[PDB]
Amino acid sequence: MFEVPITLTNRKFAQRRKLKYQYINYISRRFDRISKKSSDEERKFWKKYEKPEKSFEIWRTVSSQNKQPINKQKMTYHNFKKIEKIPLRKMEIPLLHCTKENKLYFQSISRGLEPLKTSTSEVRNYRTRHIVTLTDLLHLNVSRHNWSLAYKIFATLIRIPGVQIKSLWGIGVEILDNLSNSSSGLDFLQWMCQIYSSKSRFVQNINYRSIVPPFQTGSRTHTAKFAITYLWSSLINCQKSMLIDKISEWVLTPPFMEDAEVWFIYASCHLLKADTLSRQFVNRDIKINQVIKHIHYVRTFLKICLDKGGFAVPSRLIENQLKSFESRLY
Amino acid sequence: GLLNLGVKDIGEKVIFDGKPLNSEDEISNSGYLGNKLSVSVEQVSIAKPMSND
């Protein structure tokens, strides 16, 4: 049922993607030469598109210059009847090299009819077969609030060769929600952002299988989901020992000069300093003009959060927080 | 710092085309050089030494 971290590859699912994306191209190149008058076959199809790489879906917000007029040119039967014949008649020669179910799969997906046999079923490998067994019980016992058993499933799952980043860091609540004889959970996120963090460019022309950008890789212009997780969970933990300087120095060392969410938390480090230091326990020489840095660091690092791309902050409320810090400064 | 304060004293480096748009056949056709880079550097940062493998 659940997603399995396997690089499972069969020629039957590889020819039927080599068969379908061929048929999409001839019928879209057909739509080119009707709309004007009115080689891999998959590496060609994705050159039209731009993969999101920060998100599963490229969300295009509406309140911009992305408005569009309605094409009231509806599709009738007489337009849909001959735009699909000649790409089907031009597909006819590789449709015998394929298997007897691929041609039956194709004419099924020539007319809709979304399939029902998923690739996780018919692999029969005995090594991926124990993967799919262990992934489901892993997601079941975390769902069933059972932690000693899920920690035993997950220690066994990661030792099978063939597994991926998918199972690794996402359900690492099993150390975070254990907290009895724990390794604290944050040492594992440090393990993630020390070996998988790469600043390569997202090359986008190769067809990605079994590694997917938005939740397991960390390229340029896309800070990793596990890297910014190790930022927030090591600042919430940094409060809950009352070390802030240990991370305020540590965030300072990467210039993540694209994203804005790491600049808010780099402001939020000093915002916890200017809340903790501004107590003074008197009922006065250096402590007053040290916080005057920490107010100024929150103010400049929040502006560069606004200088980068889209990440809105409640900067009206923070200046209500910061002026309340000033009321004890005076 | 002096480096980021220095990259905005040597600001822009601009060129144009040798190709024309073939616009309206005017003095604006002669007054058109093409399109223009203004390649600039607005930030330089030194990283503390690490190791790559």
CSV table of N, CA, C and O in Angstrom, one decimal, chain A residues 3-62:
chain,number,residue,atom,x,y,z
A,3,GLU,N,4.3,3.8,-0.1
A,3,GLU,CA,5.4,4.0,-1.0
A,3,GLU,C,6.6,3.2,-0.5
A,3,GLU,O,6.9,3.3,0.7
A,4,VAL,N,7.2,2.5,-1.4
A,4,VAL,CA,8.4,1.6,-1.1
A,4,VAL,C,9.6,2.2,-1.6
A,4,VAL,O,9.7,2.6,-2.8
A,5,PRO,N,10.7,2.4,-0.8
A,5,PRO,CA,12.0,2.9,-1.4
A,5,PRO,C,12.8,1.9,-2.1
A,5,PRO,O,13.8,1.3,-1.7
A,6,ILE,N,12.3,1.6,-3.4
A,6,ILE,CA,13.0,0.6,-4.2
A,6,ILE,C,13.3,1.3,-5.6
A,6,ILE,O,12.5,2.1,-6.1
A,7,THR,N,14.5,1.0,-6.1
A,7,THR,CA,14.7,1.3,-7.5
A,7,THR,C,14.4,0.1,-8.3
A,7,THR,O,15.3,-0.6,-8.8
A,8,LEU,N,13.1,-0.3,-8.4
A,8,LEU,CA,12.6,-1.5,-9.1
A,8,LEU,C,12.5,-1.1,-10.6
A,8,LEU,O,11.8,-0.1,-10.9
A,9,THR,N,13.1,-1.9,-11.4
A,9,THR,CA,13.1,-1.6,-12.9
A,9,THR,C,12.8,-2.9,-13.6
A,9,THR,O,13.4,-3.9,-13.5
A,10,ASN,N,11.7,-2.8,-14.4
A,10,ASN,CA,11.2,-3.9,-15.2
A,10,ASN,C,11.2,-3.4,-16.7
A,10,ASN,O,10.9,-2.2,-16.9
A,11,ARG,N,11.4,-4.3,-17.6
A,11,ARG,CA,11.3,-3.8,-19.0
A,11,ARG,C,9.9,-3.6,-19.5
A,11,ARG,O,9.6,-2.8,-20.4
A,12,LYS,N,8.9,-4.3,-18.8
A,12,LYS,CA,7.5,-4.1,-19.1
A,12,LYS,C,7.0,-2.7,-18.8
A,12,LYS,O,6.3,-2.1,-19.6
A,13,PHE,N,7.3,-2.2,-17.6
A,13,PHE,CA,7.0,-0.9,-17.2
A,13,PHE,C,7.9,0.1,-17.9
A,13,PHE,O,7.6,1.3,-18.0
A,14,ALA,N,9.1,-0.3,-18.5
A,14,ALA,CA,10.0,0.6,-19.2
A,14,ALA,C,9.6,0.7,-20.7
A,14,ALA,O,9.9,1.7,-21.3
A,15,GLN,N,9.1,-0.4,-21.2
A,15,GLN,CA,8.6,-0.2,-22.6
A,15,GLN,C,7.3,0.5,-22.7
A,15,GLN,O,7.1,1.3,-23.6
A,16,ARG,N,6.4,0.3,-21.7
A,16,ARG,CA,5.1,1.0,-21.8
A,16,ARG,C,5.2,2.4,-21.4
A,16,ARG,O,4.3,3.2,-21.8
A,17,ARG,N,6.3,2.9,-20.8
A,17,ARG,CA,6.6,4.3,-20.8
A,17,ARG,C,7.3,4.7,-22.0
A,17,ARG,O,7.2,5.9,-22.4
A,18,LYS,N,8.0,3.8,-22.7
A,18,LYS,CA,8.6,4.1,-24.0
A,18,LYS,C,7.6,4.1,-25.1
A,18,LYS,O,7.9,4.6,-26.2
A,19,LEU,N,6.5,3.5,-24.8
A,19,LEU,CA,5.4,3.4,-25.8
A,19,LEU,C,4.4,4.5,-25.7
A,19,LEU,O,3.9,5.0,-26.7
A,20,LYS,N,4.1,4.9,-24.4
A,20,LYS,CA,3.1,6.0,-24.2
A,20,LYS,C,3.6,7.3,-24.6
A,20,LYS,O,3.0,8.1,-25.3
A,21,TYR,N,4.8,7.7,-24.1
A,21,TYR,CA,5.4,9.0,-24.3
A,21,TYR,C,5.8,9.2,-25.8
A,21,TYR,O,6.0,10.3,-26.2
A,22,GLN,N,5.9,8.1,-26.6
A,22,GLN,CA,6.0,8.2,-28.0
A,22,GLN,C,4.6,8.6,-28.6
A,22,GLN,O,4.6,9.4,-29.5
A,23,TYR,N,3.5,8.1,-28.0
A,23,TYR,CA,2.2,8.4,-28.6
A,23,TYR,C,1.7,9.7,-28.1
A,23,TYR,O,0.8,10.3,-28.8
A,24,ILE,N,2.2,10.3,-27.0
A,24,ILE,CA,1.9,11.6,-26.6
A,24,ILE,C,2.5,12.6,-27.6
A,24,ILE,O,1.9,13.6,-27.9
A,25,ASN,N,3.7,12.3,-28.1
A,25,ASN,CA,4.4,13.3,-28.9
A,25,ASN,C,3.9,13.4,-30.3
A,25,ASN,O,3.8,14.5,-30.8
A,26,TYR,N,3.5,12.3,-31.0
A,26,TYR,CA,2.9,12.4,-32.3
A,26,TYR,C,1.5,13.1,-32.3
A,26,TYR,O,1.2,13.7,-33.3
A,27,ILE,N,0.8,12.9,-31.2
A,27,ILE,CA,-0.5,13.5,-31.2
A,27,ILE,C,-0.5,14.9,-30.6
A,27,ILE,O,-1.5,15.7,-30.8
A,28,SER,N,0.6,15.3,-30.0
A,28,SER,CA,0.9,16.7,-29.7
A,28,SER,C,1.5,17.5,-30.9
A,28,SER,O,1.2,18.7,-31.1
A,29,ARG,N,2.4,16.8,-31.6
A,29,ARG,CA,2.9,17.4,-32.9
A,29,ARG,C,1.8,17.4,-33.9
A,29,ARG,O,1.9,18.2,-34.9
A,30,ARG,N,0.8,16.5,-33.8
A,30,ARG,CA,-0.4,16.7,-34.6
A,30,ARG,C,-1.2,17.9,-34.3
A,30,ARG,O,-1.6,18.7,-35.1
A,31,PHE,N,-1.3,18.2,-33.0
A,31,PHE,CA,-2.0,19.4,-32.5
A,31,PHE,C,-1.3,20.7,-32.8
A,31,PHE,O,-1.9,21.7,-32.8
A,32,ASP,N,0.0,20.6,-33.1
A,32,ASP,CA,0.7,21.8,-33.6
A,32,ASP,C,0.3,22.2,-35.0
A,32,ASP,O,0.0,23.3,-35.2
A,33,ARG,N,0.1,21.2,-35.9
A,33,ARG,CA,-0.2,21.5,-37.3
A,33,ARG,C,-1.7,21.5,-37.6
A,33,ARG,O,-2.1,21.5,-38.7
A,34,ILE,N,-2.5,21.5,-36.5
A,34,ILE,CA,-3.9,21.8,-36.7
A,34,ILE,C,-4.2,23.2,-36.1
A,34,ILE,O,-5.0,24.0,-36.7
A,35,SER,N,-3.6,23.5,-34.9
A,35,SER,CA,-3.9,24.8,-34.3
A,35,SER,C,-3.3,26.0,-35.0
A,35,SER,O,-3.7,27.1,-34.8
A,36,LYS,N,-2.4,25.8,-36.0
A,36,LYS,CA,-1.8,26.9,-36.8
A,36,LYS,C,-2.7,27.2,-38.0
A,36,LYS,O,-3.0,28.3,-38.3
A,37,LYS,N,-3.2,26.1,-38.6
A,37,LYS,CA,-4.0,26.3,-39.8
A,37,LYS,C,-5.5,26.6,-39.5
A,37,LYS,O,-6.3,26.8,-40.4
A,38,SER,N,-5.9,26.6,-38.2
A,38,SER,CA,-7.2,26.9,-37.8
A,38,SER,C,-7.4,28.3,-37.4
A,38,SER,O,-6.6,29.2,-37.8
A,39,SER,N,17.4,10.0,-29.9
A,39,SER,CA,16.0,10.3,-29.7
A,39,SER,C,15.4,9.2,-28.8
A,39,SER,O,15.6,8.0,-29.0
A,40,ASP,N,14.7,9.6,-27.7
A,40,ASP,CA,14.3,8.7,-26.7
A,40,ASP,C,12.8,8.7,-26.6
A,40,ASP,O,12.2,7.7,-26.0
A,41,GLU,N,12.0,9.7,-27.1
A,41,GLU,CA,10.6,9.9,-27.0
A,41,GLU,C,10.1,10.3,-25.6
A,41,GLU,O,8.9,10.6,-25.5
A,42,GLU,N,10.9,10.3,-24.6
A,42,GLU,CA,10.6,10.8,-23.3
A,42,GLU,C,11.5,11.9,-22.9
A,42,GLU,O,11.0,12.9,-22.2
A,43,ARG,N,12.7,11.9,-23.2
A,43,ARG,CA,13.6,13.0,-23.1
A,43,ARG,C,13.2,14.2,-23.9
A,43,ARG,O,13.5,15.4,-23.7
A,44,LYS,N,12.4,13.9,-25.0
A,44,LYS,CA,11.9,14.9,-25.9
A,44,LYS,C,10.6,15.6,-25.3
A,44,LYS,O,10.4,16.8,-25.4
A,45,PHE,N,9.8,14.8,-24.5
A,45,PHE,CA,8.5,15.3,-24.0
A,45,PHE,C,8.7,16.2,-22.8
A,45,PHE,O,8.0,17.2,-22.7
A,46,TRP,N,9.7,16.0,-22.0
A,46,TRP,CA,9.9,16.8,-20.8
A,46,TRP,C,10.6,18.1,-21.1
A,46,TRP,O,10.7,19.0,-20.1
A,47,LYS,N,11.1,18.3,-22.3
A,47,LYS,CA,11.7,19.6,-22.6
A,47,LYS,C,10.7,20.7,-22.8
A,47,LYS,O,11.1,21.9,-22.7
A,48,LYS,N,9.4,20.4,-22.9
A,48,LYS,CA,8.3,21.4,-22.8
A,48,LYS,C,8.2,22.0,-21.4
A,48,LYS,O,7.8,23.1,-21.3
A,49,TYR,N,8.5,21.2,-20.4
A,49,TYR,CA,8.1,21.5,-19.0
A,49,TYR,C,9.3,21.9,-18.2
A,49,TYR,O,10.4,21.8,-18.5
A,50,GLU,N,8.9,22.4,-17.0
A,50,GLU,CA,9.8,22.9,-15.9
A,50,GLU,C,9.4,22.2,-14.6
A,50,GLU,O,8.3,22.5,-14.1
A,51,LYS,N,10.2,21.3,-14.1
A,51,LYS,CA,9.9,20.5,-12.9
A,51,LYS,C,10.1,21.4,-11.7
A,51,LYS,O,11.0,22.3,-11.6
A,52,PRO,N,9.2,21.3,-10.7
A,52,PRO,CA,9.1,22.3,-9.6
A,52,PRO,C,10.2,22.3,-8.7
A,52,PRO,O,10.7,23.4,-8.3
A,53,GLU,N,10.6,21.2,-8.1
A,53,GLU,CA,11.9,20.9,-7.4
A,53,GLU,C,12.0,21.6,-6.0
A,53,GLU,O,12.8,21.3,-5.2
A,54,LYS,N,11.0,22.4,-5.7
A,54,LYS,CA,10.7,22.9,-4.4
A,54,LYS,C,9.4,22.3,-3.8
A,54,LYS,O,9.1,22.5,-2.6
A,55,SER,N,8.6,21.7,-4.7
A,55,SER,CA,7.3,21.3,-4.4
A,55,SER,C,7.0,20.1,-5.3
A,55,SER,O,7.6,19.9,-6.3
A,56,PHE,N,6.0,19.3,-4.9
A,56,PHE,CA,5.6,18.2,-5.7
A,56,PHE,C,4.9,18.7,-7.0
A,56,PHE,O,5.0,18.0,-8.0
A,57,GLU,N,4.3,19.9,-7.0
A,57,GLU,CA,3.5,20.4,-8.0
A,57,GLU,C,3.9,21.9,-8.2
A,57,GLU,O,4.2,22.6,-7.2
A,58,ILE,N,4.0,22.3,-9.5
A,58,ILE,CA,4.4,23.7,-9.7
A,58,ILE,C,3.2,24.5,-9.5
A,58,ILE,O,2.4,24.7,-10.4
A,59,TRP,N,3.0,25.0,-8.3
A,59,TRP,CA,1.9,25.9,-8.0
A,59,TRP,C,2.1,27.3,-8.6
A,59,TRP,O,3.0,28.0,-8.2
A,60,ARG,N,1.2,27.6,-9.5
A,60,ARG,CA,1.2,28.9,-10.1
A,60,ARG,C,0.1,29.8,-9.5
A,60,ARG,O,-1.1,29.5,-9.8
A,61,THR,N,0.5,30.7,-8.7
A,61,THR,CA,-0.5,31.6,-8.0
A,61,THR,C,-1.2,32.5,-9.1
A,61,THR,O,-0.7,32.7,-10.2
A,62,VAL,N,-2.4,33.0,-8.7
A,62,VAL,CA,-3.3,33.5,-9.7
A,62,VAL,C,-3.2,35.0,-9.8
A,62,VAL,O,-3.4,35.6,-10.9
